[PDB]
Amino acid sequence: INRAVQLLIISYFVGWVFLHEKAYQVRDTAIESSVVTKVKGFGRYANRVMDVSDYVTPPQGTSVFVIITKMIVTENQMQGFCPESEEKYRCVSDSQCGPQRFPGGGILTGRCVNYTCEIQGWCPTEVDTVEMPVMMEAENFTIFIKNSIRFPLFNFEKGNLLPNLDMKTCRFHPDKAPFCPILRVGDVVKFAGQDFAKLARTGGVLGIKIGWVCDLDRAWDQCIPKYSFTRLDGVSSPGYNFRFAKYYKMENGSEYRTLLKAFGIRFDVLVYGNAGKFNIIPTIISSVAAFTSVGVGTVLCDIILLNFL
Amino acid sequence: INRAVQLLIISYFVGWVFLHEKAYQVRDTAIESSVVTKVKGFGRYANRVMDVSDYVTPPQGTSVFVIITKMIVTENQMQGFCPESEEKYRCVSDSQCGPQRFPGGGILTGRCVNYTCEIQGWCPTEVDTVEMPVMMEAENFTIFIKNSIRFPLFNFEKGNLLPNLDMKTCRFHPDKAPFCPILRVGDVVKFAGQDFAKLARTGGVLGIKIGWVCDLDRAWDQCIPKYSFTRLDGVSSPGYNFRFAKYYKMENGSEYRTLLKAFGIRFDVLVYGNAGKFNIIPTIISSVAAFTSVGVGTVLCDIILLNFL
Amino acid sequence: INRAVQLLIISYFVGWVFLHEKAYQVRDTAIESSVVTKVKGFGRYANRVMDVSDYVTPPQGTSVFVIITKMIVTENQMQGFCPESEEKYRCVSDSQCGPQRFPGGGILTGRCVNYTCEIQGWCPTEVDTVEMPVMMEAENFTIFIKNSIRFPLFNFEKGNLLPNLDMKTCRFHPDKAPFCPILRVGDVVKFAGQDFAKLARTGGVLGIKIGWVCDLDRAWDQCIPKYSFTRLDGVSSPGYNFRFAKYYKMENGSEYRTLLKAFGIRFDVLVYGNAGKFNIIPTIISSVAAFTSVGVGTVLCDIILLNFL
Ligand SMILES: CNC(=O)c1cc(F)c(-c2nc3cc(C)ccn3c2C[C@H]2CN(C(=O)OC)CCO2)c(F)c1
Ligand SMILES: CNC(=O)c1cc(F)c(-c2nc3cc(C)ccn3c2C[C@H]2CN(C(=O)OC)CCO2)c(F)c1
Ligand SMILES: CNC(=O)c1cc(F)c(-c2nc3cc(C)ccn3c2C[C@H]2CN(C(=O)OC)CCO2)c(F)c1
Ligand SMILES: *[C@@H]1O[C@H](CO)[C@@H](O[C@@H]2O[C@H](CO)[C@@H](O)[C@H](O)[C@H]2NC(C)=O)[C@H](O)[C@H]1NC(C)=O
Ligand SMILES: *[C@@H]1O[C@H](CO)[C@@H](O[C@@H]2O[C@H](CO)[C@@H](O)[C@H](O)[C@H]2NC(C)=O)[C@H](O)[C@H]1NC(C)=O
Ligand SMILES: *[C@@H]1O[C@H](CO)[C@@H](O[C@@H]2O[C@H](CO)[C@@H](O)[C@H](O)[C@H]2NC(C)=O)[C@H](O)[C@H]1NC(C)=O
Ligand SMILES: *[C@@H]1O[C@H](CO)[C@@H](O)[C@H](O)[C@H]1NC(C)=O
Ligand SMILES: *[C@@H]1O[C@H](CO)[C@@H](O)[C@H](O)[C@H]1NC(C)=O
Ligand SMILES: *[C@@H]1O[C@H](CO)[C@@H](O)[C@H](O)[C@H]1NC(C)=O
């Protein structure tokens, strides 16, 4: 009975190794998904509350949006020549800056004036590096993410709005309610291992990943999404700043421009999926390989038992 | 001759099962694609026709754009305190709204006035829910979609602009001309199983999918794209509304803001591909599995015939 | 010794064929990536230098941005009826244009006036096709691309900012330094097999592909990205033009609009990945198939040697 027991044990182990790793259930990874993101929540920046229309830069609500948390405004920028207001651009001789100095505000002319050598262009350049406050109440904003995915190979359409496992006081917590699509901005920042104060002050590119890992052999309700968070702006000047320009020409001839530098927390929504469904061909391939492996194991077992090595 | 005929039949069935499901022809699903969308067509909204530059929100023509169909304008919004114009925010006592009421227009102060308790912020809030007309002529807009895909594993570059199977009066109909890239907006809405009037009045997020399913073992001209349409904004307040803010500061000191609420039909272009090419390794694997399966079938056939069970 | 030598040679060839094509090392192609693009560099267009805030259309720095190189401005567009300024719309009789003529500037009315029959809408239409100069200094712009990828199946996070194989004078050249993420716009245009003058004058949609092809069986530092460039706006009127509209209502009642037509070079960043990691199941499958193929080869070899055919 030793040979039968040993071959049964070998076959059982081979089956465990195969079906545990899903040798069958051909896998599809080309998930086609659509994301609709909507921000809700109000906050104050200077002396005035700002609704959703203000801070979020892309109003459509695409896969990628920006939550603006700090604004630096430079108004009435006129064309001309003038020195730069930054420290690092010190000029002691007229030959210091030429076709070797990286421009910071405009095209250089090869001169030197007192405030720094003359960049040409928008004269009142950004006086940056100040103690401007941040939209602290943005720590309490909420993001509603409606994600609709469709695995094409198996024709499997699904969405994250699962009605079983209200939407007015629920948040997203991976422990209590890991299924509500409403993500608190403070919660997203905290779950990424980041302090919110520094992230809002300097800016960063967070990322929300919706892993659609499902086993289609089970029921339709079993396919559930998993939310994860990360930061994708780590080097090893870190930050995320971007500028809008609004132009106007007053009737007295001069051409003006106001420049708004925004430090925000850009959110990226990345959808990844991996769905495995049972298919005849991989099942046959795996069964044949398992049979041959069991045969090889049986051929080796008697030899190793007889030789005790 | 019975055994030879039976083994030939078993081998033929195994070959049918294998080659029908493409046991060989290793498959690649990581399709790298680029989409350029351009809208053409004019329509009237208030008392004036609007060209392409007006209704479409992203002027670049990215993978996702919005066809604005309804506009609600609130001009000269000033900062301050005032009640809200919506019905649902009824206030009979000063304690009704506090740290339990969801803000609708601004940060609450805990008071109660006649128009509703005081939200702080942009005072002339949106008087919404009106009978504003819709851009009905947007039913006749056309969308030109240039899609260029490149399967990287096989180095296979292709595009949907097939010159064989003019581009001035052709539309997209899956029956007559299922190859023209020009998609009528009314046609897209109709093919999604949606009435255009309600969709334009309330807004929605349609989706155009370009399935690049091809068999590279055939000629280059055989690889063709298939267009499909769906809606990806179905819960089970449905809609798709987004707001622009334009700011101006008149010389008499006050800070103003005009808010434009747009109800549009956002179009998402999703590209999915699955290309299978013959490879030596999967062919050998499939042949070995087929040989072993045929052997197993022959081993079972004589037994089942002799035992008649 | 002939049979042993022949079977060893057959086994060696089978192993070469299998391990060379990676029969083992299950492959994942669903790469989840995030791209942050930042443009640096100044240029002059009319009589004034323009910094980053001006030419690039999406200020956020998404996966797709546009480098504007030519601007055509039409100011003070008023609603009304007037003929069109283009040549192709010749009208000799009042019945020439009707429900058969493609509108170019507005909704037609079925009349004929001297400048061309009356389109309704923004009256001072674009007088296009001029000799407007181009932002030639945009040939010296630089693009910083920070790409962070994460293969989910193997949980493999990586980025293109490799610190071993400064970032102030380095460019991207596939021969000298093929690893610096700083891409010169002129270099990108040249590597796509395109002249920069015509591309800037008419517009085009270039594409930068970051192939993340790695072998995870080696060390972590071995996984490196490969940059490639292409053009995805080739038919077989080519170009890429898009228009912004800025509205204002002067106090004397009339409603105005200024239209800015931009000819740019839109850059698309496409991330593709294919990562193979050793797994037990594919290894067993490949070993079984190799054993069976070697057996078949041995069965055929003696026959072909004895029969000499
Ligand atoms: C006459 N009024 C103005 O000039 C003016 C008014 C403003 F409310 C603001 C302002 N500050 C902040 C601060 C935060 C955290 C969020 C939004 N903020 C805003 C509003 C908009 C202004 N944006 C714009 O594109 O405007 C062209 C870009 C996005 O932010 C400004 F920067 C300028
Ligand atoms: C002095 N003139 C204005 O204030 C004004 C003029 C306008 F034509 C309009 C207006 N209505 C509609 C209706 C449809 C269906 C499409 C486009 N529409 C527009 C034009 C733009 C105005 N957009 C903007 O970003 O403007 C900052 C956002 C997109 O729509 C407006 F909302 C305000
Ligand atoms: C009172 N001043 C103006 O009206 C005015 C001022 C300007 F600098 C310009 C202008 N020309 C060029 C040429 C290049 C190559 C790049 C940027 N350029 C610009 C600036 C902006 C204006 N953009 C805008 O959205 O403005 C609403 C869209 C993007 O280009 C303009 F088109 C109009
Ligand atoms: C974000 O919201 C939380 C939850 O309401 C705020 O925390 C509470 O704030 C109230 C304000 O009246 C205090 O009475 C509570 O004691 C706070 N609770 C806790 C646990 O701190 C929080 O202050 C808000 N954040 C910001 C920046 O305003
Ligand atoms: C969209 O275009 C269609 C096709 O031209 C319009 O339908 C025709 O409209 C003309 C207008 O002169 C009528 O004479 C025809 O009888 C209509 N034909 C049909 C089959 O209805 C349609 O009206 C346009 N839609 C909108 C909203 O203007
Ligand atoms: C882009 O930059 C290059 C590199 O600096 C410029 O080419 C040089 O331009 C300087 C200008 O003083 C000349 O002295 C050099 O002789 C040029 N070198 C070469 C090899 O041509 C180039 O002119 C710049 N392009 C534009 C359009 O301004
Ligand atoms: C126009 O007026 C502004 C202030 O409104 C002033 O700074 C500027 O010098 C004037 N420009 C001209 C050309 O008169
Ligand atoms: C400025 O003028 C506007 C109308 O143009 C008026 O409503 C407002 O009260 C005035 N504000 C101040 C601060 O004088
Ligand atoms: C308003 O003034 C503009 C010039 O500023 C002029 O062209 C236009 O005819 C005037 N419109 C009205 C309605 O008075």
Numbering used by the authors:
A (entry chain C), B (entry chain B), C (entry chain A): 21 to 135, 141 to 190, 194 to 264, 270 to 342
What's the paper's own text on this?
pmcNeuronal signaling that prompts coughing is well documented and is primarily mediated by ligand-gated ion channels known as P2X3 receptors. A single subunit of the P2X3 receptor displayed a distinctive “dolphin-like” shape, akin to the broader P2X receptor family.
Camlipixant binds to the pocket above the ATP-binding site formed by the upper body domain between the adjacent subunits. This drug-binding pocket is encircled by residues that predominantly protrude from the β-strands (β3, β4, β5, β13, and β14). Residues M70, M91, F277, and L293 (subunit A) form a complex network of contacts favoring nonpolar environments, indicating a predominantly hydrophobic binding interface between the receptor and camlipixant. Specifically, R68 (subunit A) and E288 (subunit C) recognize camlipixant by cation–π and charge–charge interactions with the difluorophenyl ring and N04, respectively, acting as a lid in the binding process. Camlipixant binding induces conformational changes in the extracellular domain machinery that block the ATP-binding site and stabilize the closed ion entry gate.
